[PDB]
Design an enzyme around this catalytic site. Structure first.
Site, PDB file in Angstrom:
ATOM      1  N   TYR A   1      22.738  67.747  70.064  1.00  0.00           N
ATOM      2  CA  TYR A   1      24.091  68.248  70.218  1.00  0.00           C
ATOM      3  C   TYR A   1      24.995  67.653  69.142  1.00  0.00           C
ATOM      4  O   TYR A   1      25.576  66.580  69.337  1.00  0.00           O
ATOM      5  CB  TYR A   1      24.649  67.881  71.601  1.00  0.00           C
ATOM      6  CG  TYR A   1      23.931  68.478  72.798  1.00  0.00           C
ATOM      7  CD1 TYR A   1      23.583  69.830  72.836  1.00  0.00           C
ATOM      8  CD2 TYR A   1      23.646  67.696  73.914  1.00  0.00           C
ATOM      9  CE1 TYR A   1      22.943  70.376  73.937  1.00  0.00           C
ATOM     10  CE2 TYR A   1      23.007  68.231  75.020  1.00  0.00           C
ATOM     11  CZ  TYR A   1      22.660  69.571  75.027  1.00  0.00           C
ATOM     12  OH  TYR A   1      22.033  70.102  76.129  1.00  0.00           O
TER      13      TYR A   1
ATOM     14  N   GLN B   1      22.107  64.193  84.651  1.00  0.00           N
ATOM     15  CA  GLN B   1      23.569  64.270  84.551  1.00  0.00           C
ATOM     16  C   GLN B   1      24.363  63.288  85.420  1.00  0.00           C
ATOM     17  O   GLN B   1      25.591  63.220  85.307  1.00  0.00           O
ATOM     18  CB  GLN B   1      24.063  65.707  84.741  1.00  0.00           C
ATOM     19  CG  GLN B   1      23.719  66.621  83.571  1.00  0.00           C
ATOM     20  CD  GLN B   1      23.817  68.098  83.920  1.00  0.00           C
ATOM     21  OE1 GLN B   1      23.403  68.531  85.001  1.00  0.00           O
ATOM     22  NE2 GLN B   1      24.364  68.885  82.996  1.00  0.00           N
TER      23      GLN B   1
ATOM     24  N   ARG C   1      22.879  71.748  86.401  1.00  0.00           N
ATOM     25  CA  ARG C   1      23.815  71.920  87.512  1.00  0.00           C
ATOM     26  C   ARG C   1      23.830  73.318  88.125  1.00  0.00           C
ATOM     27  O   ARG C   1      24.173  73.477  89.298  1.00  0.00           O
ATOM     28  CB  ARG C   1      25.224  71.488  87.107  1.00  0.00           C
ATOM     29  CG  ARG C   1      25.789  72.195  85.889  1.00  0.00           C
ATOM     30  CD  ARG C   1      26.980  71.424  85.355  1.00  0.00           C
ATOM     31  NE  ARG C   1      27.405  71.920  84.055  1.00  0.00           N
ATOM     32  CZ  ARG C   1      28.431  71.435  83.361  1.00  0.00           C
ATOM     33  NH1 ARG C   1      29.156  70.426  83.839  1.00  0.00           N
ATOM     34  NH2 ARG C   1      28.735  71.964  82.183  1.00  0.00           N
TER      35      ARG C   1
ATOM     36  N   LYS D   1      16.125  71.009  72.595  1.00  0.00           N
ATOM     37  CA  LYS D   1      17.164  71.608  73.412  1.00  0.00           C
ATOM     38  C   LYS D   1      18.474  71.644  72.620  1.00  0.00           C
ATOM     39  O   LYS D   1      18.947  70.614  72.136  1.00  0.00           O
ATOM     40  CB  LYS D   1      17.297  70.844  74.738  1.00  0.00           C
ATOM     41  CG  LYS D   1      18.601  71.023  75.510  1.00  0.00           C
ATOM     42  CD  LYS D   1      18.895  72.458  75.910  1.00  0.00           C
ATOM     43  CE  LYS D   1      20.153  72.511  76.767  1.00  0.00           C
ATOM     44  NZ  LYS D   1      21.099  73.563  76.321  1.00  0.00           N
ATOM     45  N   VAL D   2      19.029  72.846  72.473  1.00  0.00           N
ATOM     46  CA  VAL D   2      20.310  73.071  71.801  1.00  0.00           C
ATOM     47  C   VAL D   2      21.246  73.879  72.703  1.00  0.00           C
ATOM     48  O   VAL D   2      20.802  74.490  73.677  1.00  0.00           O
ATOM     49  CB  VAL D   2      20.137  73.831  70.454  1.00  0.00           C
ATOM     50  CG1 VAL D   2      19.361  72.996  69.440  1.00  0.00           C
ATOM     51  CG2 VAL D   2      19.461  75.186  70.657  1.00  0.00           C
ATOM     52  N   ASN D   3      22.538  73.871  72.380  1.00  0.00           N
ATOM     53  CA  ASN D   3      23.498  74.809  72.963  1.00  0.00           C
ATOM     54  C   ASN D   3      23.269  76.206  72.391  1.00  0.00           C
ATOM     55  O   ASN D   3      22.775  76.327  71.265  1.00  0.00           O
ATOM     56  CB  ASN D   3      24.929  74.384  72.633  1.00  0.00           C
ATOM     57  CG  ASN D   3      25.386  73.179  73.428  1.00  0.00           C
ATOM     58  OD1 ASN D   3      25.259  73.135  74.652  1.00  0.00           O
ATOM     59  ND2 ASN D   3      25.942  72.200  72.731  1.00  0.00           N
TER      60      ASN D   3
END
Lengths: 314, 316, 314, 313, 318
Positions: C177, C43, C270, C209-211
């Site tokens: 995404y 990030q 994070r 990896k997805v939301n």
């Protein structure tokens, strides 16, 4: 002027095994003077048939072989043309120093429609194959339109080209014509021409071809050109006289460009080839007399008028 | 300061057969101090002839050989310039540490017309060939405009360049100037400068050149820079002093950037070359006195004013 | 859970002489469980310095080494970061499973200005050379913004990348995404997430990896995720817990995603690194407890609070 | 119908050393009949999860393994899917003729926003490595949107792809769907479909998949298709029956496309996979009965209802 | 006319070990005459099915094999078509000189929407592989739309292609049709046609195919074309007759283009293939009689009308 092989400054991107080849080519292209007399024959793409047929243009110019006849019979440093143009005639004209112009565009799309972009027409290997087939290629040419929205593409192409050319011991002449939306009225401002000249040095070119800058209140066109010649450093600057003017006015411009403007030669195209073969040959001789032999305007005009002859072997 | 070869942290993308070369180049570039004093000579493309001729600029700067005379007679870590510029002069100036600036653009197209993009000018092989022809190339440079609509192209070029450079044991300096429609007034905001520094580390750069951030209510410029130096981690941050201020103010900025802002060196261009050769040489010596030899501002100013000379303390 | 080498399903694009390396990397990445605990450290480009310095963020997070300390001292499956970031610290942190994030972009250009594009930063050969220099690279990561006007560029990059990764026996995690003009409102609709998951399988990814999808009148977020996990078939789906919620809520979200939503693990960034070293380490242990060792929310919370220790061997 | 190895017309871009491989693949793909029954399994990218989960779609279709079960248990010529999808399952389903769909796009960006572009997902070498790892790849698929502003990119990709595929003795099926600003209302006009079919031949395709053309006043859909089949020359044209409609109507449409429209087979996707496994398998058998064995509609419907069986032996 | 091998001017980009092949191909393409009769069969992409099915087009033109039957039974210099099209039929039609048309586009996107771009469809190596598999490929073709906003891309593809073809001893025909927003009403102006012809030389083409220029107050169409033939220099210019005129008018245009306009040949497509096989064959014979054998219009028309047959005079090119 006159230079020896040892006086040629070999740039550090010319590799050891190409060193002698580079010197050969530099000595040929400058005819052992350090000065470049360039006969430009690439305008068949740039302005289509506009510079070759029409009012005020001699009928012999409608045949492309005219250009090779002038190059062969006249006195020039290099003949600059597209690979294909050179390919179709070089066998019958082997005794010319050829500079292969690597990119070209037409003038059909005007700036106002879209910014200029002139693409590399083929890889360097195609030129090398032609050289290896007997063609006396001494260097390459490339045009950059700085300030064009396509500037990046031409910078990338030009930079790689100079490296590859010097790897092979070919000389490189860059035409740098800042052009585009962004440039507009500033096209021939003194700072623009000087900027153009500096960029060619940074890219590694042996010579840079620029427009002559406008005169200002402060300085004549030639006086402004001195700044650009300085900016170019160890890259020789070559310029052009006006295509529209008298023969004496033209030769005076070239003299001023060299001796006041600090130019290392000139690039002349349509001003030569739009004339009859005899007059065209006489003009190249007059141009070369100033550029290569240090003739004043008066004696050069005598050569043009056919009162005196000019040959390189004296 | 002083570092030994063993103190150089070789990153894992410098391969085994390039390790000693990388250390050689890191030592040369930093003059054995771990600090980078960079002499920027790339602006002939970036600002055309604007930095080299005109009012307030010494007449000697209109000849590009001026730059090589300064690098050779002055004291610098590296001279950064385009491949072609270096090619034309390097043979007559061999005892200089060269950093080849890989990309360049002109300043003719303003941001308002179109976002900035500076393209890689040639492949790395062209630089390697020049190195193998005897040019003392120690590293490469590259500029990224983060937040430009052309950002992606520059990220792709920079990422690959860092990997290829380290494969050959060359050091890499990234100029990171967030610029574009999207950035605007935030160009020199502390968060922006910090963001820029962090990106260079992720790309694997040895050094990152950023603008100094603006001062805020809470912190000075140098204090805000500390956040950026931190963000950069094991990538050394280099910065610049104001091209417009007095010499003492300039040298103070540099001092503050290192000792308060945590910078690992500096990049100076027109502030040096726009001066006469003598005064330009003196300024390189003053800058290097602070950057390489920990001089106080007062003592550095004495070098600039010609009251004292300056030479390197240790050579390796 | 627990799996043996024989239980690893090797896809047909993993070549014969790469089979064992793929199994090694799958066992390492999943820590012999088949489940993926991913620690996201990419990030610094994505959000610049916004996730690493500021209010509510521990001062230690402003130093990038913090991330490697967490990965080394905590319990993770893989640490996902840029090639360059990994290159600068990995010699001092060899005992970590590294996932090289192949593409990255900053968040300066918003969707409303222009659709997103995240470019591959270098070729796979650069990662391979770092691997051969002793860096424990177990796999690659790549982000696709489906529905972006730049979708095609990323599809072409991702498809080629998966093929080359499996040729070398590396595992591949795709961040998918859907984002752009075309998506907007529907970023986290159940159908969008399911579509994203299905695409990753067609590209040939090991993990996607997805939301998390939004809740609907009919189904909870985790229930909607079950549809996406199904659509991904033999590609493992990983998700994320809420960034701004309490540690118990967060661990409950992950548990739900696994046992109700059918996820094969999780990706956390994070939420971990913005904490002080000790608290960050405990959180990774709590996350890994649920993901790798089947702990209930209570016992995992106890690990987070330091009432219990957690390590992989026992 | 039935063909022998000798009846396979090997195009001149299939090199000498790839000749037998090409024939092998052509015989496999057409099941020794010269007719192509293509089972389309590439829509997980094309329409995301829209064709696989929701109202009127059987629950079993939500698991991608459904596709492979159908391909293995039913009767098909080829199964067309992305490289990655095939990679994750082919080891457990080796007795299928795989067609690797080389390009894909999603349907999130509609034509009105921007003209369509479907990029090649990887190089051909990736597919060759999978083939050499024991996957039964008989050929490649690729989609072109003629009349799109991105037409040029897909023409360049497809042209090169055909050359390389035939070099390797792989067959090539091109999906040609003229789409974009420029096309609009003309998408399924008879001239459009025929134009599409002619372009496939020019690129060197073995088969071309097109939409059926609309009926006009003078001619039915199938009658209009004859013009396209003719334009395609030595490229076989495959079409499609109406999406998830009545089984009898669907099989009647396919029958007309072959015997009136001159089609060399069919390409069917959601009409098959949106059904429960058993019914899907029976539909593949019914479709194959018409395509491969010249069954009339009534006898093919009997196969669909399971009143008769159908196999290749 | 007739030329010998020694009369072929080999350009300097045809390498030493490709020289004999180049001459072989130049002799084949021009049927040993130095004149190019080109049968254009590339319009299945260019105009889709518009030139092959519809009112006033013979039903036999809806089958692509029609084109190969015409090339085989008629008399032509080269048959120009896409790589794929040639690949599907060439094994059954080996005795044709094939020119592989390297780029193509459809006519679905009109200029008013976007300037034209025709992309190279595959690399040269694909054509070389086919040549080495027994197909009689004598050359390559490529279209450039000068003045299009995509001019640069096509210039770059064409320039590289010419260099590579000559490296292999293949001849090169460039179609050059200035087209775009910037061109518009000037498409067929004499200066436009002359400009296009000159560009082909600079790229190094063996032949250039252009549109006939319009007549002006000063000059006829064919008189205007003379300027273009001059501009093309050692690149042979080929032109076209109108597709919608009577056979006699058509054959008169072609005759004028050669003897007044200085053309080195012609390119004909739909005017041939839209006719029934027999008539199509007869038209190729009529065209070839003018182009290769110097017939008057009247005697050529007799060939078209089936009153006389036509075959080649010399086959010194084997």
């Amino acid at each position: 002027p006159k230079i020896t092989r040892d006086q040629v400054k070999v740039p550090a991107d010319v590799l050891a095994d190409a060193r002698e080849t580079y010197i050969d080519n530099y000595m040929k292209a400058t005819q052992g003077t350090g000065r470049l007399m360039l006969f430009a024959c690439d305008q068949k793409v740039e302005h289509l048939n506009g510079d070759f047929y029409g009012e005020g243009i001699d009928i012999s110019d409608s045949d492309p072989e005219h250009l090779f006849k002038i190059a062969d019979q006249g006195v020039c440093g290099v003949m600059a043309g597209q690979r294909g143009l050179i390919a179709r005639y070089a066998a019958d004209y082997p005794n010319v120093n050829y500079l292969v112009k690597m990119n070209s565009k037409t003038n059909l799309v005007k700036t106002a429609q879209d910014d200029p972009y002139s693409p590399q027409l083929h890889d360097i290997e195609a030129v090398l194959a032609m050289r290896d087939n007997g063609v006396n290629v001494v260097g390459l040419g490339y045009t950059l339109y700085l300030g064009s929205e396509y500037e990046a593409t031409m910078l990338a192409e030009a930079g790689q080209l100079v490296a590859q050319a010097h790897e092979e011991g070919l000389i490189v002449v860059l035409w740098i014509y800042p052009r585009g939306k962004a440039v507009g009225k500033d096209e021939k401002a003194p700072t623009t021409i000087a900027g153009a000249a500096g960029v060619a040095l940074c890219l590694g070119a042996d010579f840079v071809k620029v427009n002559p800058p406008v005169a200002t209140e402060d300085k004549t066109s030639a006086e402004n050109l001195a700044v650009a010649s300085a900016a170019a450093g160890r890259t020789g600057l070559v310029c052009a006289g006006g295509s529209t003017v008298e023969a004496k006015v033209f030769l005076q411009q070239l003299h001023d460009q060299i001796y006041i403007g600090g130019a290392s030669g000139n690039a002349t195209g349509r001003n030569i080839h739009q004339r009859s073969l005899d007059e065209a040959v006489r003009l190249t001789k007059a141009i070369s007399a100033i550029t290569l032999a240090d003739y004043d305007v008066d004696r050069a005009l005598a050569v043009f008028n056919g009162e005196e002859d000019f040959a390189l072997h004296h």
